[PDB]
């Protein structure tokens, strides 16, 4: 439903009793989550890529919600964990809401081969980010919200090699 | 149980009638098949308070959240924006609670 | 706290950001090696290198965005667009101020984003050209007003998608552009310094639109405990370093 | 590196980031 | 090169290198001795395949034609094939000096004809306006050869328009033109043959060489409709009454539940 | 602000105050001129040394508190709790970081001590020695349940009153022990390094809890204008300079 | 004579040839010229690094041989499994010894070989690659059952014919490999140092086995004039400057 | 070069340099100075067609193809060919850039296309994909000369896996892969004729060089029956009621009695 | 020895027994 709305950039989080899993991006440059970004669209133009992955999330919410929230990123050959304590066993961090939205997870480059591929496979997948509750999401009221946003980039040791074609391009009809 | 379709976003006309549609979500089972509980889902709470957005159901599993008309929207005074928060919960019970954002917008 | 003083004028701000300098390049004044025609272009440097603030427009429940094409916003905007309208060409840079502030029980963002040559799509169908009247609007911008199929398609209107930037290109990549977002949590205002972009050293201020500041709801406004449902941005912006020349009849009708 | 047509235009293919990802003051 | 990895112990700081803010309008200089315990690793890896000289100099194709009577006639534009435009379009400003391969299936004797703006081209074989004193023309037997010729940088300006947001007429006019058709001509080829034996595809392959891409922009997330007009809503069916709906084509898929993939 | 990196997971806070370092000590390795038994011990330096975050527990109106010991906590935690299942010993600091963070409408105290050797009484009455299971509850902790004529005492059931914090010593001279307080108002965080606090070198990680950390709620959680009545606490526990000697097989059954 | 210590254990032999040191280099550790991911890797060092003895098979008469995959045959066996199975890659060297004795009366040959990347074929027939499950059998390896047409194919079995080494290639061209032979007329044990061998610098220890200790009865057990027909032959396996990196969830099920 | 003849006379020893053990896994030391009397011969012999970069850099047949409507495709792989195959299986790991030259007996105008791994090929001639603005493309006339060019070392790895003991995905997964076969995609060649003149057949030399061979291994001793499967078990006839037979297919030879040849 | 294609994998073909033979300690 939210594809082709600006409501497809942001989730919304409440206050919740237990832990729940509120967003999972895997870690494809091939995935729609990433292809579409300016990393990923850059990327997808290359069948390898090594580095390391820069994502930011950032809450808007009123200045009195606050929240902490645990982003953890799964290794490859790790299972998407659905419990915290599996997911906390992975490259986490914790972070709190105040003063400022904005929080920043390096998914560090952890591979086997040199080179991952840019078309997601079994062989060379690169794993999964997921971000959990940490304590909760407490707004001023009782039904209050959260929207939470992320971003994606690379660090300075991100590498492409192989230059190819983009399937974030499509041509059916004659431009005329 | 997961509420699929909801984190999302609705949308009412000004001047709805009683009975229009705001979203159409659904939920998946849980892989235990245990069906829905015949008073859920519900909605708890809403961000600013707001009834008229009663959640109803459609053929099957799947779910529609309806404005009952039992308080109107009118967007040239408040509230505009509700945070409705949908509460599926199955029969051996493990809940999932959702947020439905209905936005109001301006017919003239 | 932060204060920017161009001449009979000053903008002060509370809780502010870094001030974003558009590709790390202050507005200067177009260097003898980088100039094409021979005449000595003229210099106001203090009537028109001040902040003028357009219309007010209000950010309510449903508002996609607004736009103003620069120069054209400034087009009746004092002795620049006395200038801008006297003369052949024109060069200048730009200090844009973007002012929304609602509360502690506020929530939503804006990114405020400034697009070179932000050529815009046209609202759907067959090839035809926008028209001059529809990204000229001059200093009340254009509301976006949201993409429809019964949007009206009369003459060339613009497109009116945000999240296609109203041309093809994906929002959430805007951020390529320079850009500051105003999130009602953490701040309040955003001034993005622009220099003088274009691959032509000057060219005619009402025929082309160098640049277009472009403000989008990301995130909706909810007024949270408070009966307050809209907000209103203001959008101040100073010419830099703004030079004519070529000067001639007023190119008015 | 021989230039095999004299001129400057019939060559061969030639060869910071910061003014993104940092365009502050 | 790419920089190496630098080793990092644990650290207890009170200024955190992991919480910073996205409404600045910076991206972050988070590196991963942030936020894990790195070790040295010696990073010899470029990205001397991602500049711009060998991002966009590969000699992608520009346009079609097909010889109808011995005769085929082309504008020099980047704008038919999406997938060189979508790579122009990555940047605002570029300035390139362009080589032309011909890859025809034509045998026998072709003649190309670079008309320069602002003169009537041929048009037709046998024409008089092939003889010409000053067009710069090529002749070529496709067999035993490609033609091959760099045009260089024919801009009046610094650069060429990827987009243009201006017009070429001033407010009252009435056949005024967007975008950045009229900024810049880059010319056109005129094809023709002198025989008559092979087939009638004329491909041009178009290679930009000593590229200066100035101003990046967002990468186009929808289908082309038209040339020269950056639109997105594509208007599939014109006969049957379906005609007014307009498809978006663009590249965003979704997944079935966020969270779960 | 505040950032704390051990291995594989990273600590971030906003309000936080100072690192309680526990008797002015940081966690370090045993010196040749402490140790006892003579292999060489193993180091696991980045797989056990990592921030653990056990499970979360509900501040409610009533909670009298909870307690974790440790290294009992972290026994099904990670190569950490594997190094602990196949060694005869160990020794390891810790590094505790506690978590609970409402709003600015919430009232509320939370004392986070870290009791070396607490030894706690029988739930009451008669000369019985308290469980094995009930001193040992892994992640989950033991949820204090406050004081009554009423509680269970079948099978050495620990005690259940938390002014005299569970072995009979007051409650506020609790303070004489590694602690923060956790108060709403001014932060929300409180971290505490403990070294390995011993009379001996190394012994066995299953038998023997050196450390417990005790959490009690001082002031009761006012909800203020707001209706969350009940804010989590999330318990983040990291080894630090772990060591463990007399690999054996898995001491589980 | 000979002894081998690695830490908490020691293998003893008394009628012993020069250890093979496989490729002539010794297992090391991953230079920082050699790595490919970034954090730090783990070093247990002498809880992983020991001599973990698997079970011991039967050489009989008709017994074709025996192979254990590596690190396939270590993943229950101590610390060293319980990092495989808790980190995303791992490299590791190993000292393979081998031990088979019976008597001055009895005869027989065993080529004990230790092959890198021994991908084994399919038991045959039609284009079905073999099974997980088949070629991770753990510690108690796969005896090789010898050919026969009336072998079971259910599943992706794996070849059964020693004398082309289950992948197709001739046994006696086996000594290309690290091997040695224990010949019961003159030796009774083999030990095999193997550095890591790999085109990468770690890998995933659960899907791929990097090594493949196999051993052949190449002459048969003669009894002579004994009435023992059947003798032990058991491997004790240590890994030798074994590290992990990429912490992680257990990958078991 | 190889070492020269020592001479040696009579000798009386009692360290044998003959009885060594074959237990120990090493080869003997044993030149011909140890058990005869040699005199000394200048041997200028070398083995410098027996190094890697000469025993494989032949430029051998990796794979044949036919154009069935003007339109071929082959995934680059050494397997189908036995007699490269054995020889790569000579070794574990290779590290090699190779060289493609390809032999078409087509008359006219044809072009290859490199697609690399992650992408969708062109699925026919006269097909959208051909057009391409950054897939490496080879357009030729097979008449006057042979196309030719490098691909370099695209490995993910240090190496070309030529054995791999593992799988690309976990225990509990079903669609597992053994083998090389997830390891390393060396990419595509997509063959298309813009003409319709000569013949159909496509074939492909390729020549690897600037090899490093890391492991060595035994020769292979049997006929291969599929690829990336390393399986011998030749399964002959399908259809008659001998059909779960399996021949081996192997090359050693049989001597009527030992002790007589 | 020229190279024609000013690249390392564009050029031609490029140029101890003890680890086999003798791999003892
Ligand atoms: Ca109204
Ligand atoms: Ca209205």
């Known amino acids: ?176 | ?108 | ?253 | 590196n021989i230039n095999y047509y004299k001129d400057s235009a019939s060559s061969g293919l030639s060869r910071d980031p910061s003014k993104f990802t940092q365009p502050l003051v | ?261």
């Open chain 1, 1 to 176: 439903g939210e594809v082709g709305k600006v409501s497809m950039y942001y989730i919304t989080v409440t206050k919740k009793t237990v832990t729940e899993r509120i967003l999972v991006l895997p870690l494809e440059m091939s995935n729609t989550l990433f292809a579409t970004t300016l990393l990923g669209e850059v990327l997808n133009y290359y069948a390898n890529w090594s580095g390391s992955i820069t994502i930011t999330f950032m809450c808007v919410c009123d200045a009195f919600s606050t929240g902490k929230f645990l982003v953890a990123y799964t290794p490859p050959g790790g299972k998407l964990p659905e419990d915290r304590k599996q997911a906390m066993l992975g490259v986490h961090i914790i972070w709190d809401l105040g003063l400022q939205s904005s929080c920043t997870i390096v998914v560090p480059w952890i591979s086997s081969g040199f080179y991952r591929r840019t078309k997601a496979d079994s062989f060379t997948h690169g794993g999964y980010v997921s971000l959990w509750y940490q304590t909760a999401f407490v707004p001023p009221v009782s039904g209050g919200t959260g929207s939470i946003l992320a971003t994606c980039s690379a660090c300075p040791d991100m590498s492409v090699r192989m230059l190819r074609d983009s399937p974030m391009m499509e041509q059916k009809n004659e431009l005329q």
């Open chain 2, 1 to 108: 149980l997961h509420l699929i379709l909801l984190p999302a976003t609705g949308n009412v006309a000004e001047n709805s009638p009683p009975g229009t549609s705001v979203h159409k979500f659904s939920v998946k089972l849980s892989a235990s098949l245990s069906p829905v509980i015949p008073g859920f889902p519900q909605i708890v709470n809403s961000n600013p308070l707001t009834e008229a957005f009663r959640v109803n159901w459609l053929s099957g599993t799947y779910f529609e959240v309806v404005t009952t008309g039992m308080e109107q929207l009118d967007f040239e005074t408040g509230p505009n924006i509700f945070d409705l928060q949908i509460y599926v919960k199955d029969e051996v019970g493990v809940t999932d609670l959702q947020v439905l954002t209905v936005q109001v917008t301006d017919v003239n």
């Open chain 3, 1 to 253: 706290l932060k204060q920017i003083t161009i001449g009979n004028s000053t903008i002060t701000t509370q809780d502010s950001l870094h001030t974003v300098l558009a590709y790390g390049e202050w507005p200067t004044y177009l260097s003898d090696i980088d100039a094409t025609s021979v005449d000595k272009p003229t210099h106001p440097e203090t009537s028109a290198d001040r902040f003028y603030t357009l219309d007010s427009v209000e950010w309510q429940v449903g508002s996609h965005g607004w736009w103003w094409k620069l120069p054209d916003a400034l087009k009746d905007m004092g002795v620049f667009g006395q200038n801008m309208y006297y003369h052949s060409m024109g060069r200048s840079g730009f200090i844009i101020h973007t002012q929304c502030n609602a509360t502690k029980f506020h929530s939503g963002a804006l990114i405020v984003a400034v697009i070179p040559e932000h050529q815009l799509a046209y609202v759907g169908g067959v090839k035809v050209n926008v028209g001059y009247d529809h990204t000229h609007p001059g200093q009340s911008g254009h509301q976006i007003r949201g993409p429809s199929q019964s949007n009206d398609r009369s003459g060339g209107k613009p497109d009116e998608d945000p999240l296609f930037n109203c041309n093809g290109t994906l929002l959430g990549n805007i951020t390529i552009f320079p850009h500051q977002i105003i999130n009602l949590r953490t701040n309040n205002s955003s001034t993005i310094v622009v220099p003088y972009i274009n691959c032509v050293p000057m060219d005619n201020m009402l025929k082309h639109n160098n640049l277009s500041l472009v403000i989008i709801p990301l995130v909706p406004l909810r007024p949270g405990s408070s009966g307050i449902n809209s907000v209103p941005i203001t959008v101040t912006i100073a010419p830099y370093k703004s030079e004519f020349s070529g000067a001639m009849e007023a190119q008015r009708q």
């Open chain 5, 1 to 261: 090169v790419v920089p190496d990895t630098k080793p990092s112990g644990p650290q207890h700081t009170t200024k955190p290198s992991i919480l910073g803010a996205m409404e600045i309008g910076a991206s972050s200089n988070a590196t991963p001795e942030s936020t894990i315990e790195t070790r040295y690793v010696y990073n010899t890896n470029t990205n001397a395949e991602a500049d711009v000289e060998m991002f966009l100099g590969r000699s992608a194709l520009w346009g079609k034609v097909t010889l109808t009577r011995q005769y085929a006639k082309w504008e020099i534009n980047f704008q038919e094939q999406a997938h060189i435009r979508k790579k122009f379009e990555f940047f605002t400003y570029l300035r390139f000096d362009m080589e032309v391969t011909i890859v025809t299936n034509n045998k026998g004797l072709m003649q190309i004809m670079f008309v320069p703006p602002g003169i009537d081209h041929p048009e037709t074989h046998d024409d008089r306006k092939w003889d010409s004193a000053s067009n710069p023309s090529v002749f070529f037997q496709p067999k035993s050869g490609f033609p091959r010729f760099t045009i260089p940088f024919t801009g009046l300006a610094s650069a060429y328009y990827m987009f243009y947001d201006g017009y070429d007429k001033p407010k009252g006019s009435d056949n005024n033109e967007y975008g950045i058709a009229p900024t810049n001509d880059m010319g056109l080829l005129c094809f023709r043959t002198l025989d008559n034996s092979g087939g009638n595809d004329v491909k041009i392959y178009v290679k930009p060489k000593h590229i200066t891409a100035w101003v990046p922009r967002p990468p186009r997330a929808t289908q082309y409709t038209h040339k020269y007009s950056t639109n997105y809503h594509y208007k599939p069916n014109s006969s049957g009454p379906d005609e007014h709906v307009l498809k978006d084509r663009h590249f965003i898929k979704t997944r079935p539940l966020i969270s779960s993939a």
